[PDB]
């Protein structure tokens, strides 16, 4: 198990760690999070009590370095940093643990939720979507725009998701206009899977990362990306059986985790009704259709 210590908590803040969250009071003796499961990416996120504007946070993997959080009073936020002195870091953590100044990552043994939401998410792929090469962790916030959003304004602070556009020359072969528009299999299998992502694991990793940034930061462009990547599969008549079965599992856990009270803003009625009831794959997403109908029957 690994640890992300905090120098201190000078401002009152709600801290998220993956799907969990807890409140820290102004100047409360809080010095970080311990017992973080090794083997998965993680996200540590923030919403200030005095200004809920800008949720922000950091994706990281404790196998890649020793990371800690320290508040910056000039830039007004909790920043992730890497400690290169390993002996210094182990000493700091051991002292904070001995003084019991840390919250424990509260994973129930039975509970595979975080694995199920991050199965295909890799830190190396996150770092290509979120470009800041001098750090091993990646900053994301509520307001960051995607490369596609910018085409339709600072590129260094953008989310470089793969552009998906159903009415684009990339999506439509000359001479197969009707075929390719009504059946997106070419665009999914040849252009995206074979061409850009190389395999379905990388496609699912981006899909999962987009969902998590939408849910944890309210990032609108990430929500657009998540729905586009679902619709591309559902609107293809020819999809490998193993991808369809895996997609059903991925979506089921995403829908299960979504706050009931955020459904109005995180779910696109058109896309979901199209995908579950009209698309080529309308009958391939049994687990997802069942949880959607029982949890969000209004949306449908």
């Amino acid at each position: 198990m690994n640890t992300v210590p905090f120098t201190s908590a000078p401002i009152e803040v709600t801290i998220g760690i993956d799907q969990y969250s807890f409140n820290v009071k102004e100047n409360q003796p809080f010095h970080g999070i311990k017992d973080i499961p090794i083997g998965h990416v993680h996200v540590i996120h923030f919403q200030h009590a005095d200004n809920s504007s800008m949720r922000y946070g950091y994706w990281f993997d404790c196998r890649m370095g020793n990371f800690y959080i320290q508040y910056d009073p000039k830039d007004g936020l909790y920043k992730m940093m890497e400690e290169r002195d390993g002996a210094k870091f182990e000493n700091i953590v051991h002292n904070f643990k001995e003084r019991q100044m840390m919250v424990s990552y509260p994973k129930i043994d039975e509970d595979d939720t975080w694995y199920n939401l991050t199965e295909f998410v890799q830190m190396d792929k996150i770092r290509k979507i979120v470009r800041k090469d001098e750090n091993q962790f990646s900053y994301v916030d509520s307001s960051m725009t995607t490369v596609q959003e910018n085409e339709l304004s600072d590129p260094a602070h953008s989310l470089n998701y793969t552009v998906i556009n159903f009415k684009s020359r990339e999506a439509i072969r000359p001479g197969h206009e009707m075929e390719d528009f009504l059946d997106k299999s070419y665009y999914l299998n040849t252009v995206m899977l074979q061409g850009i992502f190389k395999n379905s694991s990388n496609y699912f990793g981006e899909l999962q990362f987009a969902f998590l940034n939408a849910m944890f930061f309210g990032n609108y462009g990430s929500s657009l990306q998540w729905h586009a990547m679902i619709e591309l599969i559902c609107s293809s008549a020819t999809v490998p059986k193993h991808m369809l079965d895996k997609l059903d599992e991925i979506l089921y856990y995403q829908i299960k985790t979504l706050p009931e009270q955020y459904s109005d803003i995180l779910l696109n009625e058109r896309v979901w009704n199209i995908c579950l009831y009209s698309s080529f794959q309308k009958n391939s997403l049994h687990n997802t259709e069942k949880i959607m109908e029982n949890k969000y029957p209004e949306l449908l």
């Binding site: 009415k167 020359r169 439509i172 206009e177 009707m178 528009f181």
Partner: protein, 237 residues
């Protein structure tokens, strides 16, 4: 965006534009089969592609052979229309290509946009106007060329005859839409009005009779009466 009554003079400016109407692309008759089921028989159709400023009509005749062995014909017909309009644009010299294409039915937007991806600067627009271009098949010379076709064929017409020698495009389009609306509402009576005077003929190179300016005013009033008359018959007014 969409073309309506607010921006109506835009039709007659110097930016090349075409209307595309697909109503008559896929045409069928319905008949009982020997077993007492129902079947369709497709008949020849046409794409109606019109420059409203000049009157140039590009009438692509759709021969029934294009439907052979195809499924979902009403969907296919929109894509066939878009394919043919795209082909027409590519066949025109650059300086004759439209800057906008206005589709009369919103179901043509995606098929045409997709076929025109290579022309990102040609705007594809719907319209709020209810235009009577379905009645094109009520113009005898157009119906004749469509029904006689034995293969795909493009035929070019000027749907305004020589009217632009005497009236503006705006007035020519208004007369055309009034004539077509009348032919759509009561074809028999409209053709009666247009021909009831044997001394006014249709030139070989024209679609409509050779009315003088005064006679067009009379004809136009008779068409408006016909439309109003049918409106009263329909709604019991």
């Amino acid at each position: 965006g969409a073309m309506n009554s607010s921006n109506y003079a835009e039709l007659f400016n110097n930016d090349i534009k075409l209307f595309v109407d697909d109503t008559n692309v896929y045409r069928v008759t319905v008949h009982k089969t020997f077993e007492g089921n129902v079947a369709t028989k497709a008949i020849n159709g046409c794409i109606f592609t019109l420059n409203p400023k000049t009157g140039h009509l590009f009438l692509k005749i759709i021969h029934t052979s294009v439907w052979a062995g195809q499924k979902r014909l009403s969907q296919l017909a929109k894509w066939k229309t878009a394919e043919e309009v795209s082909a027409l644009v590519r066949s025109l010299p650059k300086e004759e290509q439209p800057k906008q294409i206005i589709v009369t039915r919103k179901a043509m937007l995606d098929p045409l946009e997709v076929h025109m991806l290579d022309f990102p600067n040609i705007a594809i627009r719907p319209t709020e106007l209810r235009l009577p271009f379905s009645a094109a098949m009520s113009i005898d010379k157009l119906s004749d060329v469509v029904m006689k076709a034995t293969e795909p064929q493009m035929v070019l017409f000027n749907i305004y005859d020589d009217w632009l020698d005497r009236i503006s495009s705006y007035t020519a389009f208004s007369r055309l839409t009034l004539l077509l609306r009348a032919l759509k509402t009561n074809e028999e009576s409209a053709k009666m009005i247009l021909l009831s005077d044997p001394t006014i003929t249709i030139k070989s190179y024209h679609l409509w009779p050779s009315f003088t300016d005064e006679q067009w005013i009379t004809i136009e009033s008779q068409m408006r009466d016909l439309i109003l008359t049918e409106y009263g018959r329909k709604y019991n007014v």
